[PDB]
Amino acid sequence: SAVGEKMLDDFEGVLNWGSYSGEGAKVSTKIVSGKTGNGMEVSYTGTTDGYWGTVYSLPDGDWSKWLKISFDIKSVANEIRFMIAEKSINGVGDGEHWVYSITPDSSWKTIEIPFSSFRRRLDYQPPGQDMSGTLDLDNIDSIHFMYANNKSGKFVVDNIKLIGALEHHH
Ligand SMILES: [Ca+2]
Ligand SMILES: [Ca+2]
């Protein structure tokens, strides 16, 4: 593993995130004040069968040198999911979905999730999933902030970054 970190989005540069929804649910995103400088506000309304999410599709899918994914989050409290999708076995589209549930609170908090802590999604898997039961870090398609339930809410994210190994002195 590599040491240190690699920033994916501090929201001070170009706009990278797209929105998607279906089956009654709705989502919208905008640039607002973040932890430092800019951040992205995600506003969602859920339905029983509805899905929503915001997605950054990655140009380079090889994350095999990294160990964790980190982000700052704050509510504007409803549970949501951070999701990592592998690349499809058919070449185009999303593959195996891997999830971690998080609940944004009133104050800014840093959430660091090791890749080994992600769980294989069971409510949905896309047709291009590899069914391997292992999160293949060398084959990453995209990252998502997405629905976990049928409820509504608003949150802000900032400082999305990869974390490698720490330099332990003892
Ligand atoms: Ca920022
Ligand atoms: Ca897999």
UniProtKB/Swiss-Prot annotation:
It comes from the Bacteria. Residues 2-165 form the CBM11 domain. This enzyme catalyzes the endohydrolysis of 1,4-beta-glucosidic linkages in cellulose, lichenin and cereal beta-D-glucans. In the N-terminal section; belongs to the glycosyl hydrolase 5 (cellulase A) family. This is Endoglucanase H. It comes from Acetivibrio thermocellus (strain ATCC 27405 / DSM 1237 / JCM 9322 / NBRC 103400 / NCIMB 10682 / NRRL B-4536 / VPI 7372) (Clostridium thermocellum).
